[PDB]
């Protein structure tokens, strides 16, 4: 029957990463969650009129456990790489994330879209100007999205289905 | 009818309950939301106790209770005014005779008695349970030791002097087993030689015990202070959650090990009895309940410099392939399989702690602190119960210990194990794919060969154990 | 995962917590601190099933003997313990299985009735007499040291597989 496509969102933690997901797959309209419950990291959604299934992997939490990024990376089919607009070294971070989904997938084009999460009303440190630089210089797509609004939030997740589906 | 309450005005405990001050969910209520001296209120219920609900609560108040503060509205309930002489016992007085105090008696009973040993058994849990809010604010503990030590009267004398030594004791501050711990096993390294310790020639058994008498001791030793908050991913997390970032480094550091003692035996030969060991060492891991160890290897085993070694995997045996297959398993459809096992077995085991820190971390961003509920704030108490359970769960697998000897040098052994030496995580890690690279280049190159470096019997004891007299 | 409410109930003293606590830990407790209520909880395969114990450990002090109806009315089965070397706590025991009844309004509660401390070589409860009552209550008997752990898993699990039988 339908596609579904394994999402794995990457970044750094303590920064508010697992709001994307969170707000996605959320009762989007009742602020309340149990991430315990089987396939709260599942969701069929409607992307350009074709009903697919979105089975979302975010690890946020488990940052420290830094040997495990290549098993829990090799189950994607795309990655959401996110930083904190409010945290610069997140954003540094950014380059080495890439540089690792590009090794375990032993591909140089890997379908990958840049996020820029907003997770607190703390002064913004990464100017969108140089985010979009560097996904242009990766030639991938950049997302700014709210932590609190749910803005972007779907635009993120839809814009990385797009990638696959035009890999 | 119900025994009359104080007035609310003199004491707030006694307010109805509504809308306006608590919320249940749909035989006792369970809380969804409430204000603090709601939940205080229901803390130290005089129809029941809840001794759930009180660990629950004393996990999770500081998001929304100071401690100085918590202190200050217990010592408030425990303060229940006793009412007046009724109409009959003023007649009885009137005549010169002794008043039967009926209802006087009954609210001694079934109302102060049981709210205020209800209150010291919240304090009892906080000062055994919690006493990190006394270590961290001596100024709290003295409050805590006066206000126990100056309650008067004979009904609670037996826990006022109890709690009094516990406290004293907790300032200053053994197993029994149905059976023998089985002989240590012993391969190339012979006892005392720590010198000749590595991956071939200890005992793959004795490997795999050690390292689980270490990983049991690291999940033992994490508390639940490391986290509720969220403290482990927050700026302070050395400070706040020192015992889980220590257990999760020893995961990481024995990951890379298992990569560099494979990807540095450049032999092909050797290198397949590395990994063969390995799967071994998994097996025992597997055998003990060991899932941390069981995942340290599948991570290793996964991991960029491992997984592309196409000619080691292919001398590997199929038992050994599906044992690791089986193994990585476990962690497919986000951990179903492993989910399931763990709540199948037969402890002691040690958990993956990941799965806690992801469930507890979305748990908490992904619910509001509080509810509007009327025009009013109510503490979202439905939030604190979920992460509880989470810490509940990790708590309740922390209290069986292993029946295994420590080798104390294994033990040292492992404890000491730094694969990255100096280098930096991502320098190491570039070194360790290179690595890889080089022992087993990239198609069309060709395979080249390379010497030997163990002097030693590469041939595996197995992994069944042996039992002389 | 079937999950058991198993509550454990007698005199002040006779070592409901020791029990509880060997059996959770593995561990004995030498301090006497008295309880007001504890819960533990533990995973345990017992007959090849796994199941979750939440264990109630209750206030023995004649101070607590008022509060008894709230934990009796939650618990599925009952450890009555009383110590060997006490008669008195021996002669509390029928106090607490009355209660029992009347509260459950049952005849037919899982029960095990617990003579603790067998470890101690100065008894004064006979086994004989113990059994008799457990006989006329009918349910099994179990001595048990919280010390040295004797008899402690199988008054536990007996417990459980009443309450699985019931
Ligand atoms: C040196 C080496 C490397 C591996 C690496 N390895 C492999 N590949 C695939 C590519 N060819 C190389 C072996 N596939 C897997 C798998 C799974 C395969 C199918 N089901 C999903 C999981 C899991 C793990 Cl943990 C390790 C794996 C395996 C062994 C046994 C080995 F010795
Ligand atoms: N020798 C021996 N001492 C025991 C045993 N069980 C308990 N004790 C001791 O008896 C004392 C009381 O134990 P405790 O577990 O606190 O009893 P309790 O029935 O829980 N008391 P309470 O009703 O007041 O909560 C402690 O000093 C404890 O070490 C046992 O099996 N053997
Ligand atoms: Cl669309
Ligand atoms: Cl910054
Ligand atoms: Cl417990
Ligand atoms: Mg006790």
Redesign the interface.
Known sequence: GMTEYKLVVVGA??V?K??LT?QLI?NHFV??????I?DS?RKQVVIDGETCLLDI????????????R??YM?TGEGFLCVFAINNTKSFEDIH?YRE?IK??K?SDDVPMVLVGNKCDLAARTVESRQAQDLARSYGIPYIETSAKTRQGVEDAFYTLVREIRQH | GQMRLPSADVYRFAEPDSEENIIFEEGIPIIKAGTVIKLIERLTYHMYADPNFVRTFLTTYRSFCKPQELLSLIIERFEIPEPEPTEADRIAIENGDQPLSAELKRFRKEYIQPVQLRVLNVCRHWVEHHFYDFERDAYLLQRMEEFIGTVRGKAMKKWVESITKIIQRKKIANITFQSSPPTVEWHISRPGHIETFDLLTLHPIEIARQLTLLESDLYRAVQPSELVGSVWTKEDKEINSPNLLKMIRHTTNLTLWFEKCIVETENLEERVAVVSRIIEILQVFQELNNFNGVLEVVSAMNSSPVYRLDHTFEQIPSRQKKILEEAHELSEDHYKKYLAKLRSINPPCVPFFGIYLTNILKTEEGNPEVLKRHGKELINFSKRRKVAEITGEIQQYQNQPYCLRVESDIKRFFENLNPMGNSMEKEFTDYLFNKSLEIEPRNPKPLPRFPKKYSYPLKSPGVRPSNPR
């Open positions: 933690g303590g508010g697992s709001a969170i959320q602020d309340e969650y149990d991430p315990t089987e990291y992997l975010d690890t946020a939490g488990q940052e420290e456990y830094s040997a495990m290549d098993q090799r080495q690792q090794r375990v032993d």
